[PDB]
Amino acid sequence: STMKFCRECNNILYPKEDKEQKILLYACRNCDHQEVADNSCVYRNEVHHPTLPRTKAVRCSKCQHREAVFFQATARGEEGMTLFFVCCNPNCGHRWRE
Amino acid sequence: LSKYVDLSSEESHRYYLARRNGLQMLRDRGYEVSDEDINLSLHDFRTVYGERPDVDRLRISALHRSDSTKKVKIVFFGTSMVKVNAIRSVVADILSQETITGLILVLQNHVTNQALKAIELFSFKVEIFQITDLLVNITKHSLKPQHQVLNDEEKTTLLKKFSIEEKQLPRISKKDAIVRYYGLEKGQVVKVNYRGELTESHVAFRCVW
């Protein structure tokens, strides 16, 4: 979250919403100073966030690897449930569908 | 292979599968129910009932072949947690209605031991089942060996060869599937024959105890 300090005493600024002026202000609890910079009092936090399937018969370029990740998904170009084969990229990086 | 996921309520498919498995269980029980009723499919049940299930239509009945008072039934009365008073009321309804009173009373959810104490208040046996324990039938499994039960005139001819009582015979507990799916009172050996192709003639006459 945003961090601010009292200009006068270098202290933590506490957010305070003024109901009279209908604006957000930041005032230090310890002493006596207040102001507004961007009105963006945030509780910002980074909420923290797999290969289950595998193929055994997909054709490869030359060696017949038969390794790929198959799963049903929807493409951004054509809507609908369609098998999306994540190829092992033997000679092409584009993922091919059935 | 666009999966035609059933937009209908899962409760409808659940009730259909449960009733189908119950009707097949009663067919195995040796009761006379019209095979046309058992032949009802999911699409027919959906056409008749719709996609929203109704807990009002639950009547199932059956009859015995050579007996005079043996007629067991199924009522899917349970859809939420109930009390002993609900079972008592349905039992009083079927008591003032007719004499077929003995029936299965399946429950959609967990059962209470107070109900297990209360079944003794009724002068007959019942079978508390689940609405999920009748979603996949048994005896139609490629790993279940066919179970045959003998009558008390040729089973009684086990003291002739083995000369052994049922206590020393290999036991089976009255809580497994094929013991709570046919109906087995103590005093009849289940002459299990292993139809598993890898298993040889390992008949054990595993009786209930």
């Binding site: 509780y43 923290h48 | 498919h13």
Partner: protein
């Protein structure tokens, strides 16, 4: 003269010796002998040798063969008829020659001799054949020189090129999964077989080392060239840091090139010099072997004690049925198979078998765990698992885990079955809000109405899953459920949290000027109760929680499960049909697992799984999806299915670890498991249940 027939493997325990096999091989290599040599060997025989094989030739006169020597070593009259050798009164007709079939042939010969005449004849035959063979070799001599361990620099460069080719997949082994590890093991086995074929060209190594045994091949290749892999991630005995932040730094300090994939791809051998890093890795592997071996000797001892404290009273009576000493209980009706085949086994009426089955089950385990074999480790572990199952158990990992088969496509289109396999996961995964979040913002809005809160949660574009603004829908239903529940105490401000709503209009971007990202897909969940910022802050920390965690239901998922992965398996292990396949197709079988929702009574691990998947008719109801456990088939099917699933798994594990067949002992043990009303293991609580159900009054056993 009575313990020749083994009650463990079924064959003669008098197996072949090293010197005996070596002498027999070096004697069969030279079919014809001289005169003085032939006469000197027969001396150790039993009877004379009137007729010679080769009467007259160009330069040789009377010349005998090893076949007549074996004949005079054979008993007087015998008729084997084993489809490869014929004998009629100490007259051998034909004797095939192979690489290792001679041992099996002579084993069949001695078994036929034992079953025909008796044990004394076999003892005399062995006592007449051993010194003869010892003398035969002694004249010839056998030794190994340095030429036998020839490197063959051309083949060495070939092996080095093969190593360079095979080191490419080393980068993607410890990162993706264990299937690549098994493929790596297969490739290493193939390269080892190639090196063994390139190594067995000598005369002494081929005659002194077995060929069909994998352990001999490993111990021969590891000491001549291409030392095997010695650093793996499957062993829990050592810490993962030793291979995560030690070996890479060692290779970077000591080696010039990066070579990050140099963990078990060491090029040195035992015949050549070994690098210090290679010696360090080898010492680490040796220490791991030693600790595993010590545990392997320590714990199976306790296991044998536990399984022996209970199998000491199972003895057959005169009636032929298996009886118990306490309460005169019956376990089995007859010990011995009653199939179409018939054999007069050594098992009699007054003979104990429970102790015999105990020892015959404790023996295979010992071997599997004394050796450090990782292939046998999995096999040993499954056996250990079946030996520890208990009548009372709570939320074990095995019970919740359930296999999930499918139905073959009627159309038969390529990948149609696979299409179904990927699809079913999508109804059993548990995607949650958390996975999809990437940031978290809170802005102040200018101004009765008073709502200054716009989370802009900012989920990533994972539209592959496809979740709709229908996220809003699960959030709305969850907050409605939370607000409707008034029986809970000290609940959040649900009356003010009803104002949460998602709106993606491509214009909500109000992030800080730093970064210049300008992303999309916001989230406008806001709840207001007052104007002071402190109440806004504390409220935010509480409700934040429900969303990224609780909103599992939002996308592609059911709760009450963790995930679903597809695993290929051999169908011949679970079912035996007349039109079975080669068990090599890329068929994928799912493995659901249940998420602490197995808290349900006994096991509803099934009851929970059949319920979620109710919107997929591809699931087959014959050849059922069986839970990978022992106690759950007791509730799904009858006791017969549990008996079958136990005996099949024990037989498979025994065949994987050993070669002797013990089907009768496995059946006896599985029946001993089914006595107290429920499938119970061999432990303290199991022994208490056995003593309470069968009324066993034996304080001495529990005191020991």
């Amino acid at each position: 003269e009575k313990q020749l027939l083994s009650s463990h493997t079924g064959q003669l325990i008098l197996q072949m010796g090293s010197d005996s096999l070596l002498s027999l091989r070096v004697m069969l290599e030279r079919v014809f002998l001289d005169k003085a040599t032939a006469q000197q060997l027969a001396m150790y025989g039993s009877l004379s040798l009137p007729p010679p094989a080769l009467r007259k030739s160009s330069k040789s006169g009377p010349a005998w063969t090893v076949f007549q020597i074996l004949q005079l070593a054979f008993p007087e009259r015998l008729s084997c008829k084993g489809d490869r050798f014929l004998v009629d009164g100490s007259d051998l007709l034909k004797f095939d020659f192979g690489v290792d079939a001679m041992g099996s042939i002579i084993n069949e010969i001695v078994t036929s001799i034992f079953l025909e005449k008796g044990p004394k004849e076999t003892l005399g035959f062995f006592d007449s054949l051993q010194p003869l063979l010892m003398e035969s070799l002694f004249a010839e001599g056998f030794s190994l020189s340095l030429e036998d361990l020839s490197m063959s620099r051309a083949d060495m460069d070939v092996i080095h090129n093969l190593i360079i080719r095979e080191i490419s997949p080393m980068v993607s082994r410890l990162r993706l999964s264990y299937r690549d590890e098994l493929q790596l093991e297969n490739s290493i086995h193939k390269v080892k077989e190639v090196a063994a074929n390139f190594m067995l060209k000598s005369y002494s190594i081929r005659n002194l080392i077995d060929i069909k045994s994998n352990s001999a091949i490993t111990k021969l290749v590891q000491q001549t060239g291409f030392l095997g892999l010695q650093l793996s991630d499957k062993k829990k005995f050592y810490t993962k840091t030793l291979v995560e932040d030690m070996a890479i730094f060692c290779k970077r300090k000591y080696g010039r090139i990066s070579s990050s994939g140099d963990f078990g791809i060491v090029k040195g051998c035992f015949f050549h010099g070994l690098d210090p890093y290679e010696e360090m890795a080898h010492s680490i592997a040796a220490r791991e072997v030693i600790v595993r071996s010590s545990r392997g000797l320590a714990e199976p001892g306790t296991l044998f004690k536990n399984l022996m404290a209970v199998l000491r009273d199972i003895v057959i009576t005169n009636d032929g049925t298996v009886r118990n000493t306490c309460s005169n209980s019956v376990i089995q009706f007859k010990y011995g198979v009653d199939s179409e085949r018939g054999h007069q086994g050594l098992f009699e009426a007054g003979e104990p078998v429970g102790v015999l089955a105990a020892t015959a089950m404790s023996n295979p385990a010992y071997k599997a765990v004394l050796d450090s074999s990782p292939n046998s480790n999995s096999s040993w572990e499954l056996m250990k698992e079946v030996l520890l199952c208990k009548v009372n158990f709570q939320n074990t990992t095995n019970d919740r885990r359930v296999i999930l088969y499918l139905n073959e496509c009627h159309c038969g289109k390529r990948f149609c079955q696979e299409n179904a396999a990927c699809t079913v996961r999508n109804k059993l995964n548990k995607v949650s809000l958390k996975d999809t979040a990437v940031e978290f913002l809170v802005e102040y809005r200018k101004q009765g109405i008073d709502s200054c809160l716009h989370g802009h949660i900012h989920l990533n574009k994972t539209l592959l899953q496809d979740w709709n603004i229908s996220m809003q829908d699960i959030h709305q239903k969850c907050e409605d459920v939370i607000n409707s529940l008034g029986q809970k105490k000290k609940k959040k401000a649900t009356d003010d949290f009803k104002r949460t709503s998602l709106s993606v209009s491509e214009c909500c971007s109000f992030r800080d000027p730093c970064g210049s990202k300008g992303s999309d897909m916001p989230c406008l969940t806001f709840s207001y109760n007052a104007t002071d910022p402190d109440l806004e802050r504390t409220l935010d920390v509480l409700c934040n929680t429900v969303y990224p965690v609780l909103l599992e239901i939002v996308i592609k998922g059911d709760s009450r499960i963790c995930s679903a992965n597809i695993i290929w398996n051999s169908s011949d292990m679970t079912t035996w049909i007349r039109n079975r396949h080669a068990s090599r197709r890329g068929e994928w079988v799912l493995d659901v697992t249940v998420e602490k929702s197995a808290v349900k009574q006994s096991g509803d691990a099934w009851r929970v799984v059949i319920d979620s998947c109710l919107s997929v008719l591809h699931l087959i109801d014959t050849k059922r999806s069986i839970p990978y456990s022992v106690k759950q088939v007791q509730e799904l099917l009858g006791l017969s299915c549990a008996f079958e699933q136990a005996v099949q798994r024990l037989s498979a594990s025994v065949r994987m670890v050993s070669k002797g067949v013990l089907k009768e002992h496995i059946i006896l043990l599985a029946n001993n498991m089914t006595c107290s009303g429920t499938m119970l293991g061999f432990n303290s609580g199991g022994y208490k249940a056995l003593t309470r159900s069968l009324n066993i009054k034996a304080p001495f056993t529990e005191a020991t």
